[PDB]
Amino acid sequence: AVTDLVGASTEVSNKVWDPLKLSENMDESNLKLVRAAELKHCRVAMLATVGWLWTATGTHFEGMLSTSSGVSFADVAAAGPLLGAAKVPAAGIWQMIAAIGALEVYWENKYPAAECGGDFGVPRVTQDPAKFKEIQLAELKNGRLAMIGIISFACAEAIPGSVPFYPF
Amino acid sequence: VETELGATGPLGYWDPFGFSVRNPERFNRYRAVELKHGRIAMAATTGYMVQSFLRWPGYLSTSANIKFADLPNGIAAFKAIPPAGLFQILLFIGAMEAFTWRYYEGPWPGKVPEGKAPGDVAGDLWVRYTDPEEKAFKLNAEINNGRAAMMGSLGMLMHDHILGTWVPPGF
Amino acid sequence: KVNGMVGDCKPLGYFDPLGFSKDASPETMAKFREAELKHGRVAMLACAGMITADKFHPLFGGKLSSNPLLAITQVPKLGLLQILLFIGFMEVFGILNSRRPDYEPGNFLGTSQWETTPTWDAYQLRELNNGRLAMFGAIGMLTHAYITGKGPLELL
Amino acid sequence: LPELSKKLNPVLGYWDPLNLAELNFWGAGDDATVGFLRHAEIKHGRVAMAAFVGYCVQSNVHFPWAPFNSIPTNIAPAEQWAQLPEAAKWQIILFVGFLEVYSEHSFILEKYGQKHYMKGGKPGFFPDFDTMVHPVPLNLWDPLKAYKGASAERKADGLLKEVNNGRLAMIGIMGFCAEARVPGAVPALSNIAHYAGDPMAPFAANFHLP
Amino acid sequence: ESLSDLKTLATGLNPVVGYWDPLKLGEAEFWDNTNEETIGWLRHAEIKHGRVAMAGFVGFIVQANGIKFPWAPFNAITSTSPPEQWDQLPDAAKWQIILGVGFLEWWSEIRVDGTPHYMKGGKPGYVPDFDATPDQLPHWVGLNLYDPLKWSKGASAEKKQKGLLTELNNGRLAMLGIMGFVSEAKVPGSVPLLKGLVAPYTGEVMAPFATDIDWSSW
Numbered sequence A: 001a002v003t004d005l006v007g008a009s010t011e012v013s014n015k016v017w018d019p020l021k022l023s024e025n026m027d028e029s030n031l032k033l034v035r036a037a038e039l040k041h042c043r044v045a046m047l048a049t050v051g052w053l054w055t056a057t058g059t060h061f062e063g064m065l066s067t068s069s070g071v072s073f074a075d076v077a078a079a080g081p082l083l084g085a086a087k088v089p090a091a092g093i094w095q096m097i098a099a100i101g102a103l104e105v106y107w108e109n110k111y112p113a114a115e116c117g118g119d120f121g122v123p124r125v126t127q128d129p130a131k132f133k134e135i136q137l138a139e140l141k142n143g144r145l146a147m148i149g150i151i152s153f154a155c156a157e158a159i160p161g162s163v164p165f166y167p168f
Numbered sequence B: 001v002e003t004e005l006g007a008t009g010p011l012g013y014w015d016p017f018g019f020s021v022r023n024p025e026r027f028n029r030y031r032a033v034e035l036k037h038g039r040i041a042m043a044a045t046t047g048y049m050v051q052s053f054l055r056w057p058g059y060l061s062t063s064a065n066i067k068f069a070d071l072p073n074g075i076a077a078f079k080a081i082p083p084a085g086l087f088q089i090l091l092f093i094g095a096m097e098a099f100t101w102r103y104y105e106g107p108w109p110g111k112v113p114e115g116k117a118p119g120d121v122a123g124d125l126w127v128r129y130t131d132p133e134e135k136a137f138k139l140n141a142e143i144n145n146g147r148a149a150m151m152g153s154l155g156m157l158m159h160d161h162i163l164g165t166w167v168p169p170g171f
Numbered sequence C: 001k002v003n004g005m006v007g008d009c010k011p012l013g014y015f016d017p018l019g020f021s022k023d024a025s026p027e028t029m030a031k032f033r034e035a036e037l038k039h040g041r042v043a044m045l046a047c048a049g050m051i052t053a054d055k056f057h058p059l060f061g062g063k064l065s066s067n068p069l070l071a072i073t074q075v076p077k078l079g080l081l082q083i084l085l086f087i088g089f090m091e092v093f094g095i096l097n098s099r100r101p102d103y104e105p106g107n108f109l110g111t112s113q114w115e116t117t118p119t120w121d122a123y124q125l126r127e128l129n130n131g132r133l134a135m136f137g138a139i140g141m142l143t144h145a146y147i148t149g150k151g152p153l154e155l156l
Numbered sequence D: 001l002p003e004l005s006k007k008l009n010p011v012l013g014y015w016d017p018l019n020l021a022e023l024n025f026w027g028a029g030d031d032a033t034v035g036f037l038r039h040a041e042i043k044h045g046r047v048a049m050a051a052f053v054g055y056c057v058q059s060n061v062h063f064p065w066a067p068f069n070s071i072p073t074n075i076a077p078a079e080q081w082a083q084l085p086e087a088a089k090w091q092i093i094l095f096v097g098f099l100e101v102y103s104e105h106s107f108i109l110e111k112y113g114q115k116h117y118m119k120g121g122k123p124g125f126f127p128d129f130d131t132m133v134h135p136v137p138l139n140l141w142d143p144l145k146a147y148k149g150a151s152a153e154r155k156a157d158g159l160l161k162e163v164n165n166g167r168l169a170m171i172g173i174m175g176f177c178a179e180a181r182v183p184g185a186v187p188a189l190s191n192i193a194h195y196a197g198d199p200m201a202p203f204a205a206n207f208h209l210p
Numbered sequence E: 001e002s003l004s005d006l007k008t009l010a011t012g013l014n015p016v017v018g019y020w021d022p023l024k025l026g027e028a029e030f031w032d033n034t035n036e037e038t039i040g041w042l043r044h045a046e047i048k049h050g051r052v053a054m055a056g057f058v059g060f061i062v063q064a065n066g067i068k069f070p071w072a073p074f075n076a077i078t079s080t081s082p083p084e085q086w087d088q089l090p091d092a093a094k095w096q097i098i099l100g101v102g103f104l105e106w107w108s109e110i111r112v113d114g115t116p117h118y119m120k121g122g123k124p125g126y127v128p129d130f131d132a133t134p135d136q137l138p139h140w141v142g143l144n145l146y147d148p149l150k151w152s153k154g155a156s157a158e159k160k161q162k163g164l165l166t167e168l169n170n171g172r173l174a175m176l177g178i179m180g181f182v183s184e185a186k187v188p189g190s191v192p193l194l195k196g197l198v199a200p201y202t203g204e205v206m207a208p209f210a211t212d213i214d215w216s217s218w
């Protein structure tokens, strides 16, 4: 059932790209699971690329991130996108992870990944399923490019010389 | 017109002056006017609140030596925009309303575009809520948030024209 | 519970990509379940041991907290031999259980004689999930102890 | 263009070294490829024929009014463009910019029966101007309403003569403009103009692009 | 298809030579495929090497002659030994050359208009047409990679196969010539009749960007 999906990209001549044959023997309720994992990776990667660009360009908020122990948003931004990740206090990291996990638990109990392949029922911008398949393919391609891009940003910030066309 | 959208809250159908009981055929134009006003008001309120703690990086013109972080908060921020930037903002709004999001058909006054709903711009690539209870709730939420944003944007404008900020004194 | 085996948790269901359990004999399933459960139990013991021995090590005195150093700085050869003898005794009993013609895989209690409810399956799933978590935690703990030289309750 | 260039010229005719008639031109088509080229054939002719005749009057006499007057005449008129004020340069380009925008309006072009040139319309056809927001006395082509009573044979002869005089003048002005800077380019002239500034730079004497 | 390989070669140099391969790269299987796929891959590799070699030989002749792009960044470097011109290029220029070539061959691998791949039965060394499928490219570009101005377009198939044979022979000769020039840049005395030309050069020609490893210990 891997030949159906949406992910058939014209960059690989509109056929399924599985050189290691990872989806040869995987069955339903796992194919939908790996599609849900890919879609969540897509969305988190796109949000991560936008946030990384916002931090690297410098933007940041105005105020004090944790008035008990200093640390302004300018202090977080000035350390860089990667090195300015430990400048956040541990309580802020735990609160962010707790809110994300509450959303994860609610959406997993409401829309299980094994049954719903990455579909959490967010409205929908079009009917006419051909256009919707085109929009799904656009989402998949954008998310895959963002998956490559955020790891590229992390590698270029940590190891200089890699990613030659890296801004900042 | 008492059963249409917007007549949901504690007041029910609230028309003191009776604009739509004097002219019940003029409700659709008034609804479109209210919907555009509400959407512009939501954008304006969000801009007022977000510009206080969030500011873009870099310059604004790189020719008048004006920064994004140098525009104070409000009316003076729109003052310090260069004339080319103002012209581009007006061009964007004019192209956005005359051709893309077209609220009016008709030669001079503008009735409603065909048999569409009032404020039924954009089209095609826009979320179309099925499940008519959900659609009614979403539309009533849009209208009520628009009205609240109109009052809030008016208040912050009143504050900005007599202070340097939209925050009332004592806050 | 699919194929008579507990598992199949909520966040991800019957987790068999790569087809390890497609078209396989029940003996292979018993071997896989034995491996998974024994890994989980060893790893729960390992995680609890490093966590407790980081801050509470009274058995020999001052005995460091970097876990690979713990096994070599002391624990004389008789102690390691006694630990290995105990584990070998339990593994011999595991083999003797595996030869019996009532062999539920990870079962030394032999619960086929007693009546079981879905609460029993829930508790088995609790053991399995905690085991898998400790598998990942124990590998991570040993990796940190090699990279930095500090225990789990250290490094923080 | 079709193979009817034999009417414009025998011996030669559809010479076409760089093929250019089927490169599909933004994916529009082969007819649209022909229609765009034929318009740019004669639009470049109409500018060059007016500019070369424009040259031969500028270098001797100037209009006696005021603003584009009293600047030196014994110089290159390409340099005389650089002596214009900045408002004059903007207004000249934008006035042509109206004429370009107005002539490409397909709803104006269908008032007189024609269409946009590479959608099937005639390559060169300026509109008869009578649809503007406010009326004007004089239009652009045939202002005095003089020679629109001519038969199609005089129009067909004139259209071919417009092309052939077009190709002759595009060589005429550009070879002449190549004589102002890099002197000695045309050994037939070689006795006019100076100045090494770029003629393809209307605002070089006023500001810089970066 | 170890039979059409001989039909191609009977027209290569008459029967004076034919199917000449001492180590017999034909009748091979390679990466878990059939002999026909390997034959098509080897033919495409030979054709691509030949095209790259003719382009490189012409570029070496032009660059060592002295013809150089005036513009702006290529005016900065002032040498002659083509290899050293590549070495003193900016890193971004070399990377953009490499990535543009990579995009061109990424398009060459894509078969959305022509039905067969060059391993699955297509013509070896066939770059697919850009405008054949105008709805399956990211944005429109005219001026296709092969035949930008449609100069060949309508031609006899006999002329096409004769041109393919001519391209193959010229490619092989250009391969030999450009390797002779590179070995002139590296090994003096090698490749006679060319000793009086080319400059001495170091820096492992078959490596871009950084240098200083080389085949110093042969």
Ligand code: CLA
Binding pocket: A002, A003, A004, A005, A006, A007, A008, A009, A012, A015, A016, A017, A018, A022, A023, A031, A034, A035, A037, A038, A041, A144, A145, A147, A148, A151
């Ligand atoms: C989180 C990563 C992730 C996951 C889970 C998937 C999952 C999937 N992809 Mg996919 N993809 C990804 C990332 C991912 N993709 C990226 C980044 C790209 C861009 C290169 C693509 C491009 C792509 C194409 C073009 C196609 C798919 C398709 C598919 C589906 C079937 C293939 C399959 O089962 O094998 C993937 C299953 C996995 C479990 C892969 C996990 C990742 C491995 C184990 C690790 C690899 C490490 C990597 C090599 C290190 C370098 C990467 C990076 C650092 C640069 C499946 C739902 C096909 C499809 O849907 O067609 C219907 C298809 O045609 N993908």
Ligand code: CLA
Binding pocket: A033, A034, A036, A037, A038, A040, A041, A044, A096, A097, A098, A100, A101, A102, A104, A105, A108, A113, C011, C012
């Ligand atoms: C309390 C927090 C919380 C909880 C309960 C969940 C719960 C869930 N997340 Mg989730 N997530 C969270 C926070 C949380 N998330 C945050 C903060 C992020 C970052 C924005 C993500 C990003 C994320 C992605 C991208 C994906 C999930 C997925 C999942 C689901 C399966 C998780 C799984 O199998 O274990 C995790 C199992 C593993 C084997 C771990 C992955 C190991 C990879 C190979 C290496 C990654 C590094 C590692 C995670 C970091 C550890 C430290 C490092 C130094 C080693 C589940 C619904 C997945 C899903 O729904 O797919 C069906 C999925 O694709 N989440």
Ligand code: CLA
Binding pocket: C001, C002, C005, C006, C007, C008, C009, C012, C013, C014, C015, C016, C019, C020, C021, C029, C032, C033, C035, C036, C039, C132, C133, C135, C136, C139
């Ligand atoms: C080696 C340990 C091990 C073994 C033998 C098993 C065995 C089994 N698991 Mg299981 N599992 C494990 C670890 C293990 N698990 C871990 C760590 C997790 C947490 C992510 C899970 C989560 C899990 C779920 C959620 C489910 C199972 C299920 C099953 C059963 C059927 C699936 C199957 O055929 O797997 C056969 C497994 C193997 C042959 C082991 C493959 C080992 C490979 C070679 C490891 C490769 C490296 C790995 C990908 C990453 C490790 C390195 C990392 C630390 C960097 C089977 C008895 C299913 C079940 O109970 O069905 C009723 C089920 O639903 N497992």
Ligand SMILES: CCCCCC(=O)OC\C(C=C=C1C(C)(C)C[C@H](OC(C)=O)C[C@@]1(C)O)=C/C=C/C(C)=C/C=C/C=C(C)/C=C/C=C(\C)C(=O)C[C@@]12O[C@]1(C)C[C@@H](O)CC2(C)C
Binding pocket: A046, A047, A049, A050, A122, A123, A124, A125, A142, A143, A145, A146, A148, A149, A150, A152, A163, A164, A165, A166, A167, B127, E095, E099
């Ligand atoms: C040929 C040109 C190539 C350019 C390069 C490029 O491509 O960069 C790629 C790249 C990075 C990179 C590079 C490499 C790839 C590694 C290559 C280079 O290395 C070399 C030497 O080569 C360097 C570098 C840096 O360039 C990164 C790409 C990042 C990418 C692609 C980021 C997408 C975000 C999408 C978002 C956030 C969507 C939000 C959408 C949202 C939030 C919504 O829809 C909201 C929604 O409410 C809506 C509106 C309607 C609702 O109903 C539904 C919901 C609720 C969902």
Ligand SMILES: CCCCCC(=O)OC\C(C=C=C1C(C)(C)C[C@H](OC(C)=O)C[C@@]1(C)O)=C/C=C/C(C)=C/C=C/C=C(C)/C=C/C=C(\C)C(=O)C[C@@]12O[C@]1(C)C[C@@H](O)CC2(C)C
Binding pocket: A123, A125, B041, B042, B043, B045, B046, B125, B126, B127, B145, B146, B148, B149, B151, B152, B153, B155, B156, B167, B168, B171
């Ligand atoms: C791509 C562009 C999309 C643009 C549209 C958009 O972005 O809409 C996003 C959207 C929903 C949506 C979507 C659709 C629109 C349905 C479709 C989209 O998908 C597409 C593309 O189809 C995505 C989706 C699902 O998200 C909704 C946005 C709603 C918004 C922005 C609502 C602002 C309220 C402000 C209020 C009530 C202020 C009250 C102010 C009050 C009450 C005050 O008195 C102010 C006050 O100051 C005073 C005067 C004194 C102070 O002392 C105290 C305070 C401070 C209290």
Ligand SMILES: CC(=O)O[C@H]1CC(C)(C)C(=C=C/C(C)=C/C=C/C(C)=C/C=C/C=C(C)/C=C/C=C(\C)C(=O)C[C@@]23O[C@]2(C)C[C@@H](O)CC3(C)C)[C@](C)(O)C1
Binding pocket: D023, D024, D025, D026, D027, D174, D177, D178, D181, D182, D198, D199, D200, E140, E141, E142, E143
């Ligand atoms: C020192 C010296 O030399 O003195 C010289 C200086 C100088 C200046 C050289 C001289 C001169 C005059 C010259 C040379 C004047 C030349 C002016 C010239 C030749 C100006 C071209 C404009 C080209 C345009 C606008 C192209 C648009 C092109 C476009 C928009 C496209 O490419 C679109 C495209 O759709 C196509 C068409 C094909 C499609 O399939 C695909 C795509 C989408 C890509 C002199 C007078 O001789 C003296």
Ligand code: KC2
Binding pocket: D046, D047, D049, D050, D122, D124, D125, D126, D127, D140, D141, D154, D155, D156, D157, D158, D159, D161, D162, D165, D166
């Ligand atoms: C500075 C600009 C300029 C110059 C120097 C110039 C020189 C010549 C010469 C001398 C070599 C000839 C012989 C000639 C002949 C024709 N011209 Mg020109 N012409 C210029 C501009 C325009 C414009 C704007 C239009 C136009 C037209 C026609 C028509 C057809 C009319 C008809 O068929 O109704 C004919 C026959 C109109 C058009 O082609 O519309 C169909 C039209 O709108 N012309 N034209």
Ligand code: KC2
Binding pocket: E051, E052, E054, E055, E123, E124, E125, E126, E127, E128, E145, E146, E159, E160, E161, E162, E163, E164, E166, E167, E168, E170, E171
């Ligand atoms: C560095 C670049 C380069 C060089 C130096 C070069 C030299 C020669 C020479 C002189 C030695 C000849 C005589 C010749 C002849 C042919 N070339 Mg080459 N060619 C180069 C590039 C390409 C590309 C990219 C393609 C291509 C092709 C053809 C076809 C087939 C046309 C057809 O079958 O319609 C024929 C006849 C196309 C192809 O092979 O299609 C199957 C195609 O895609 N060529 N080519």
